[PDB]
Design a binder for this molecule. Structure first.
Ligand SMILES: O=C(O)CCC(=O)C(=O)O
Ligand SMILES: O=C(O)CCC(=O)C(=O)O
Ligand SMILES: [Cl-]
Ligand SMILES: [Cl-]
Ligand SMILES: [Mg+2]
Ligand SMILES: [Mg+2]
Ligand code: NA
Ligand code: NA
Ligand code: NA
Ligand code: NA
Ligand code: NA
Ligand code: NA
Ligand code: NA
Ligand code: NA
Ligand code: NA
Ligand code: NA
Ligand code: NA
Ligand code: NA
Ligand code: NA
Ligand code: NA
Ligand code: NA
Ligand code: NA
Ligand code: NA
Ligand code: NA
Ligand code: NA
Ligand code: NA
Ligand code: NA
Ligand code: NA
Ligand code: NA
Ligand code: NA
Ligand code: NA
Ligand code: NA
Ligand code: NA
Ligand code: NA
Ligand code: NA
Ligand code: NA
Ligand code: NA
Ligand code: NA
Ligand code: NA
Ligand code: NA
Ligand code: NA
Ligand code: NA
Ligand code: NA
Lengths: 539, 532
C-alpha cells in the first residue's frame, strides 16, 4: 500500500550500499524533496554529516574532504538548479581524481517536462564529466534490492578516480502512511545487512606494468620533475632523486623540500638550460606544474624520453613529447623502479639554485606580496597543512620560497577555478582536523564569500590570508572586515611584519578562522618576480 | 599573426550578434577570454555589465533578458567559469529568456592533456540550451560567411531559451593586417543593419475554429506569469466573458478575486468551480498551494494552456490543448463576446476573504508585511519576488494592482541567483524596484550586493529573515557601502522607505521574523475562510 514507506526503504538501501565502499563523510544542503535521502542519511549512524546552504560551495566542501581523506565523499541535494551548482566541484574532481558521489534527488519521470515545480532534466546533466553516471529507475518493488545495490557496487567498485552522479527519482508523495510496505523487499538481502563488504565486489585495478628497461634508463642523464603528490610521496621522491644523482625540480605542490629552490628563477639562466639539454630522459611524477619557467622548459625540452607517472589516467603532457604515460601510485612506482647510488651529473645547477635563493633573500624586507610569499614558510602552523589558491601569490611561493619536505599542501589546480576556494579549504581543514593556513586573492574571497559561514566551524585554527589588490557610484575598494564581522570571525589588517607576526600568534590560539587581510599593489609582486628572474638570468 | 586573425574571427562573432537585437553584454574578467572581451569593448553596439562571480553573471544576464525581452550575451573564459552558467541557462530553458553564452575555450590540441584551465566544453550543458554551436578552431580557410551564417541560423531560429556557443581560440592571444581581407569578403554587410542570412520562422498555434462554441460554456480563466500589458488584457477579457479569473501574483491582472489561496479551501467555491466545463490557463508557473491542488483535481471537459513557451505545461496531464502563442496575440485571435457571469458564490467569498485578512493586518509579522506590500510599491516601478514563504503570502494575502510589473525566477524556483537577477531586472528597464527575498536567498547570492551597488534608479531589497546561523545583514550592507535598516514596527518601516526612493542606490531593509508566525497566520486564515 504505502509509496512513502517503500521510497524510504529504497533510499536506505542506496545509502547502506555507499557505506560498504568507504563513504564516511556526507554533505547535505537541506530542501524538502530530497527528504528521503537526507532522512535515510540521518538514520544511518555510519555517516559524519556536513551542511551548507549554497550547493556550489557544498560540492567544494565535499571536494576538500575527499582531497584530504582520499576516500569517496557523498553529496545529497534536492531536485532542480540545486543539482547544477554541483558542476564546478564535479569538474575539478574529474581532473584531480576526487571521488565525489553525487546523489541528486529528482522528481519522478511523470513530472518531468510538464510545467511541474523544481523539475528539470537531470539524467546526463553533467555530460562526460562524471567517471560513472547511474540514472536510477522510478522506485518499485518489482526491481529487487539486489539489482539496486549491485548497480551501486558496480559504479563505486570500478571507480579508479573522479566523481559518480547517481540520479535518484522518487515517486510523490514523500511523506505519510508509515507501514511495512517494502519490508520483505529489503529482507531478501539477508545477512548482507550485518555485513561489512559490498554485495557485489567488482574492483579491478588500473595500473601500468614495471618498465623492464628501467635498469638501463636509471643510468642515463635524467631529470626528475615533481608535481602534485602526497606529503609522503614528496619525501620519497626527494630521496630517490638524490640517490639517482639527478637534479630534482620540485613544485610548490610536491612537498619534496625543493632541494633546488627558485626553479622559476634559475631556469632563466642559459647555464642551467644548457646542462638540462644534456638530459637523456625526464621522469615527471605528479602533475599540474605551477611555474611559468618550468612550464616553458617542459614544453621545449627534448629528452630521448619523457615519462609521466601519476595515479590519474590520460595524457598529462600538454607538449605531447614522445615517451611514456604511466598510471600508478607514485610510492608503489618508486618501489617498482628503485634507485641505485650514482654520482650527480649536474654541476652548475646546484650552484645557480643557491645563488637564486640568496638573491630573493637580499629582498625579503619590503612589506609586499612577493616577500610574504618568500617568508611563508615562517608562518606555517606546526603539524599543520597549507591550502593554496589560484593566484599570483602562489606562483610567487612556488618561485621564491622553499617549503619543507613532507609538509602538507593542498589546492584546486585541476582547472584552477577561483569559485570554490574557501569552501574547499573548509573541507580540507575538517577532514584532517589540522590547523590550516589558506592563502587566497580577494576575488576568490569575494567569489566564495558565503563560505565564510562554513569557516566559522573549523575544528582547529584556520588562518585565511586574503591578498587584496583591489582587485551609479564611483567604484569602491572592498575590504573584508565587515565580512569577517558578519560571520563572527577574527580579522586583522596588518600594516607591517610586526603586525602580521602578531596577528598570526593570536590566530593560532583558538579554533576558528582569522581573516588576515594583506592589502597590496597590482604590480609589486609581478614586478619583483621579473627583477629576480633577470638578476638570476645573469648569474 | 595568429593573434591578429583571432581578434577578427571574435570581431565577426560579436557583430553578427548585434543584427539580432543583442544590446547587453555581461562579462566576467578572465585571461583566456580576452579576445571576445576586447572585441566586445570595441563594438559600440553593446552595453557592458561585469561581475566577478560567473553564476551571478548568468543571472544578471537573465534578469536583463527577462525585462528587455531581447537576447543577452554572456562571455566567460575557459574552465569551471563556464559551468557556473548552468543554473541560469537551465532557468532560461524553462522561462524562455534568450541567453547567448559565449564560452572561450582552449584550442582542441590543449583539451585532455593536463593543460591549465582546460576542460571538455562542447555539449557540457546537455539538453538545456535550445541550440549549441561548437565553433571550429579559427582559420582563414573557413570563410567569414560561414561563421556569420552559423550564428544567424542559431539566433534567427531561436524561439526561446539559451544558446551555447563554444569559441576555441589558438594561442598567442602583434597587431598585423592578417585577417583583414578575410573580413572584407562580407562586403557591405559590415555597413548593413540586418543579418547575413535571414532565417526566422514563427512557431505558433492556429486559431481554434471552435472558440465561438467554447467561449459560451461555463469557463474558468486561470492567469499565471505573463507581461503587465497581458495581465490587463486578460482581466478585461475574463470579465467580458463572465468567467471567474483566478489571477496569480505573477499575473498583474489586479486579482479581481483576491485571496484565491483561501477561498479555494471553501466548499461553496469548489462546488461552483465543479460546474466549470473549460479551463483556459494563460501563462504558467502558478504559485498557490490551493490553486495547484485545485488545478490537479479539476475535471473540465477540456483544459487549455496558452503560453509562448513550448511543451507541456499541465502537470495533471488533462485532456485538452496546449497552445503556443504570445498571450496578447492569442486574445485578439480568440475575442471575448459579452456574457452574463455564470458564478455567484465566488465574488462574495473573495471579498470576505480579503476582509478576513484586513482584520488581521496589525501584528508586525511576515504575513502582514505580505498583505500590506502594495503600500510600499514604488510609483511607476516594478516588483521582483523571490521563491520564499513571504511571496506565497503575497499571493495569498495581497491584491497587487493590475498592470504593475512583477518579475521572478519561477521556472525551476532556484534560490541561487535572486539578487543578481534583481540587479539585471533594475538595469534592463531603469525603473525603481522593490525586491523581496529571504535570508537564505540573500546569503546564497551574497556577493551580488556588488551588482546591487550599481543601479540606475533606487532599489530596495527587503530581506525577510526568519533565521534557523542567527546571521544578520548589517555588515553585508556595510561591506558594499549600501544603506541599511532593521525596522521594528510599521513606523520605522515606512521611514526606511521614504529615504530609500531618493537616490540611484540600493537600500537593504531587513525584517526579522519568526520561523512559524507566517505559516500559522495563513493556516488560521484558510480555516476561517473555509468556514464562511
Ligand atoms: O592572481 C592574481 O594576480 C590575484 C588575482 C586575484 O586577484 C584573486 O584571485 O583574488
Ligand atoms: O524567509 C522566508 O520568507 C521563507 C523562505 C526562506 O526561508 C528563505 O528563502 O530564506
Ligand atoms: Cl576521493
Ligand atoms: Cl582545426
Ligand atoms: Mg586579487
Ligand atoms: Mg528564511
Ligand atoms: Na563507511
Ligand atoms: Na533547486
Ligand atoms: Na557510466
Ligand atoms: Na534517473
Ligand atoms: Na534482493
Ligand atoms: Na564493488
Ligand atoms: Na503494514
Ligand atoms: Na603497462
Ligand atoms: Na619495458
Ligand atoms: Na611543497
Ligand atoms: Na611542503
Ligand atoms: Na652555457
Ligand atoms: Na602524457
Ligand atoms: Na603505461
Ligand atoms: Na612560480
Ligand atoms: Na586565489
Ligand atoms: Na559566495
Ligand atoms: Na559561493
Ligand atoms: Na570569465
Ligand atoms: Na520569464
Ligand atoms: Na530574452
Ligand atoms: Na552544451
Ligand atoms: Na577544427
Ligand atoms: Na583548422
Ligand atoms: Na581548405
Ligand atoms: Na548563408
Ligand atoms: Na572558434
Ligand atoms: Na548577422
Ligand atoms: Na540556407
Ligand atoms: Na485570485
Ligand atoms: Na483573481
Ligand atoms: Na500557498
Ligand atoms: Na500543491
Ligand atoms: Na495543456
Ligand atoms: Na526568496
Ligand atoms: Na519573470
Ligand atoms: Na518566473
Amino acid at each position: 500500500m504505502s509509496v512513502s514507506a517503500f521510497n524510504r526503504r529504497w533510499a536506505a538501501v542506496i545509502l547502506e550500499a555507499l557505506t560498504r565502499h568507504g563513504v564516511r563523510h556526507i554533505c547535505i544542503a537541506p530542501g524538502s524533496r530530497s527528504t528521503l535521502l537526507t532522512l535515510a542519511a540521518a538514520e544511518n549512524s555510519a555517516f559524519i554529516h556536513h551542511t551548507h546552504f549554497d550547493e556550489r560551495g557544498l560540492g567544494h566542501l565535499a571536494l576538500g574532504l575527499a582531497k584530504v581523506s582520499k576516500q569517496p565523499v557523498a553529496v545529497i541535494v534536492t531536485s532542480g538548479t540545486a543539482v547544477a551548482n554541483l558542476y564546478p566541484a564535479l569538474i575539478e574532481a574529474g581532473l584531480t581524481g576526487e571521488k565525489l558521489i553525487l546523489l541528486t534527488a529528482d522528481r519522478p519521470p511523470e513530472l518531468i517536462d510538464c510545467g511541474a515545480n523544481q523539475a528539470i532534466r537531470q539524467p546526463g546533466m553533467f555530460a562526460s564529466h562524471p567517471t560513472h553516471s547511474i540514472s536510477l529507475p522510478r522506485p518499485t518493488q518489482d526491481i529487487p534490492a539486489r539489482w539496486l545495490v549491485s548497480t551501486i557496487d558496480h559504479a563505486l567498485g570500478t571507480l579508479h578516480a573522479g566523481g559518480v552522479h547517481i540520479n535518484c527519482p522518487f515517486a510523490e508523495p514523500l511523506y505519510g502512511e508509515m507501514d511495512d510496505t517494502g519490508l520483505s523487499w529489503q529482507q531478501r538481502l539477508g545477512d548482507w545487512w550485518q555485513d561489512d563488504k559490498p554485495w557485489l565486489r567488482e574492483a579491478p585495478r588500473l595500473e601500468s606494468e614495471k618498465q623492464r628497461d628501467w635498469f638501463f634508463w636509471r643510468q642515463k642523464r635524467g631529470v626528475v620533475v615533481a608535481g602534485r603528490m602526497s606529503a609522503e610521496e614528496g619525501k620519497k621522491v626527494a630521496l630517490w632523486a638524490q640517490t639517482l644523482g639527478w637534479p630534482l625540480i620540485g613544485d610548490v605542490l610536491s612537498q619534496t623540500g625543493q632541494p633546488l629552490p627558485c626553479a622559476d628563477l634559475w631556469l632563466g639562466n642559459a647555464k642551467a638550460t644548457s646542462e638540462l639539454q644534456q638530459a637523456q630522459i625526464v621522469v615527471q611524477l605528479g602533475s599540474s606544474l605551477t611555474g611559468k619557467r618550468l612550464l616553458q622548459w617542459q614544453a621545449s625540452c627534448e629528452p630521448e624520453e619523457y615519462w609521466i607517472v601519476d595515479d590519474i589516467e590520460g595524457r598529462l603532457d600538454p607538449a605531447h613529447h614522445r615517451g611514456r604515460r604511466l598510471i600508478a601510485n607514485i610510492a608503489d612506482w618508486l618501489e617498482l623502479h628503485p634507485a641505485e647510488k650514482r654520482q650527480p651529473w649536474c654541476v652548475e645547477i646546484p650552484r645557480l639554485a643557491e645563488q637564486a635563493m640568496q638573491a630573493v633573500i637580499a629582498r625579503r624586507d619590503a612589506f609586499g606580496e612577493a616577500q610574504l610569499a618568500h617568508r611563508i614558510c615562517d608562518y606555517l602552523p606546526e603539524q599543520g597543512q597549507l591550502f593554496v589558491g589560484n593566484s599570483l601569490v602562489v606562483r610567487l611561493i612556488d618561485a621564491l620560497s622553499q617549503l619543507p619536505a613532507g609538509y602538507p599542501v593542498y589546492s584546486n589546480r585541476g582547472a584552477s577555478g577561483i569559485d570554490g576556494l574557501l569552501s574547499t579549504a573548509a573541507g580540507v581543514q575538517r577532514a584532517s582536523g589540522k590547523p590550516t593556513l589558506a592563502i587566497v586573492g580577494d576575488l576568490s574571497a569575494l567569489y566564495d564569500l558565503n563560505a565564510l559561514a562554513l569557516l566559522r566551524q573549523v575544528s582547529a585554527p584556520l588562518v585565511l590570508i586574503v591578498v587584496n589588490n583591489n582587485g551609479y557610484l564611483m567604484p569602491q575598494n572592498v575590504h573584508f572586515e565587515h565580512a569577517a564581522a558578519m560571520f563572527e570571525l577574527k580579522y586583522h589588517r596588518p600594516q607591517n611584519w610586526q603586525e602580521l607576526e602578531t596577528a598570526f600568534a593570536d590566530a593560532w590560539r583558538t579554533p576558528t578562522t582569522t581573516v588576515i587581510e594583506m592589502v597590496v599593489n597590482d604590480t609589486d609582486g609581478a614586478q619583483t618576480l621579473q627583477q629576480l628572474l633577470a638578476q638570476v638570468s645573469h648569474l
